[PDB]
């Protein structure tokens, strides 16, 4: 878990390095994936030109940064297609919608065996609280693993937030861009250890796989997606949650949707609080301090 965050990045920008990277990823059970794309003038939904594809698997302690721009999409696809198409190797994503659209549109490939960890988290929230909101990476790492992320380089982040320039076109890439690019795939693989193969997780992995497959089918159609699967960008389709995860949950104490019994203020505020000694759990009439004859 802690070891994954210390994986160094290896830039893959030659045919020789690509063949070696493929060989490693071919022996994996799970591969975390992400993309860095050109920032657009529109700042649109559809990702710009693919610059990097980031990969980090369980087979080797390393983050591959595939320079798709240098290699070209044709070279990258020829060596990575069957790997991406192999359903026996799980492809991990954190919000896969735009990435899947980009892989379909720009690279001509639809990945198989996809698991979307953002959707996984929302599916847990649906099961327990009838909440269909998508949460950011920082929130999910905190909530699931207890970690607080460092946060990205601010000059890198400001350049992306401005969106007046491609940013990821420039070669060679400076180290603080390469480190920024490598960050999310480390976090994704780390999250999979907490969410996948864990009996305390109240949703089955196969159910989230099938829910993720609906996203992949919707977003990998060989062309730009006009109609979104979700009502707003920061939520998950409720009918899809109903179908693949089941009914939404709620508080077992007060009956309300939006929180669990462990978070319930009505439960905690409703407990007996001793007016004489202040302790929760008994009243003053049953207090041993106030009434030592009881002890
Ligand atoms: N405009 C938006 C707003 C949110 N989102 C998604 O919803 C998540 C939660 O965003 P908020 O932090 O705004 O709640 C983001 O991490 C992102 O995946 C999006 O993709 N587009
Ligand atoms: N943690 C929480 C959150 C909400 N609640 C209660 O649940 C009810 C409905 O919650 P919302 O206000 O989120 O809709 C309210 O009566 C609120 O006080 C609670 O008792 N504990
Ligand atoms: Mn992404
Ligand atoms: Mn990223
Ligand atoms: Zn409650
Ligand atoms: Zn007392």
TrEMBL record:
What are the binding positions for AMP in this chain?
36-37, 161
Protein name, per record: CCHC-type domain-containing protein
Q: Which organism is it from?
A: Trypanosoma brucei brucei (strain 927/4 GUTat10.1)
Q: Which residues bind GMP 1?
A: 36-37
Residues that, per the record, bind GMP 3: 286, 288
Domain CCHC-type, residue spans: 273-287
Question: Binding residues for Mn(2+) 3, per the UniProt record?
Answer: 279
Binding residues for Mn(2+) 1: 34, 36, 184
Positions of CMP binding: 259, 263-266
GO biological process entries: piRNA processing
Q: What GO cellular component entries does it have?
A: kinetoplast; mitochondrion; PET complex
Q: Which GO terms describe its molecular function?
A: 3'-5'-RNA exonuclease activity; nucleic acid binding; nucleotide binding; zinc ion binding
The entry marks the following residues as binding Zn(2+) 2, namely: 151, 187
Could you say which residues bind UMP here?
Answer: 258, 263, 265
Keywords carried by this UniProt record = Calcium, Metal-binding, Nucleotide-binding, Zinc, Zinc-finger
* Annotated residues for binding of Zn(2+) 1: 15, 19, 79
Question: Which residues are recorded as binding Mn(2+) 2?
Answer: 34, 99
Q: Where does Zn(2+) 3 bind?
A: 251, 254, 259, 264
Where along this sequence does the record place binding of GMP 2? Answer: 263, 265
Which residues does Ca(2+) bind? 34, 36, 184
């Amino acid at each position: 878990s802690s070891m994954i965050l210390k994986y160094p990045y290896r830039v893959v920008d030659t045919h020789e390095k690509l063949k070696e990277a493929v060989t490693s990823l071919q022996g994996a059970r799970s591969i975390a994936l992400d993309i860095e794309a050109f920032c657009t003038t529109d700042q649109a939904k559809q990702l710009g030109r693919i610059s990097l594809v980031q990969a980090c698997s369980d087979a080797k302690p390393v983050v591959f940064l595939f320079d798709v721009l240098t290699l070209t999409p044709d070279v990258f696809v020829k060596d990575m297609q069957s790997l991406l198409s192999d359903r026996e190797i799980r492809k991990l994503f954190f919000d896969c919608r735009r990435d899947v659209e980009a892989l379909s549109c720009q690279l001509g490939v639809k990945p198989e065996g996809v698991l979307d960890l953002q959707v996984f988290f929302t599916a847990i929230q649906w099961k327990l609280r009838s909440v269909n909101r998508r949460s950011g990476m920082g929130y999910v790492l905190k909530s699931v693993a207890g970690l607080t992320r460092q946060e990205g380089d601010s000059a890198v982040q400001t350049a992306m937030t401005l969106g007046n320039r491609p940013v990821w076109d420039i070669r060679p890439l400076p180290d603080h861009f390469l480190e920024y690019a490598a960050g999310d795939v480390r976090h994704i693989l780390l999250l999979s250890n907490y969410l996948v193969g864990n009996k305390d997780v109240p949703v089955d992995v196969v159910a989230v796989e099938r829910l993720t497959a609906q996203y992949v089918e919707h977003y990998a159609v060989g062309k730009p997606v006009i109609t979104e699967a979700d009502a707003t960008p920061a939520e998950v389709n409720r009918a899809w949650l109903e179908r693949y995860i089941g009914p939404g949950g709620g508080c077992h104490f007060c009956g309300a949707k939006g929180h669990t019994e462990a978070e319930c203020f009505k439960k905690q505020n409703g407990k007996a609080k001793c007016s004489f000694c202040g302790e929760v759990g008994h009243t003053a009439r049953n207090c041993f301090k106030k009434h030592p004859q009881l002890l």
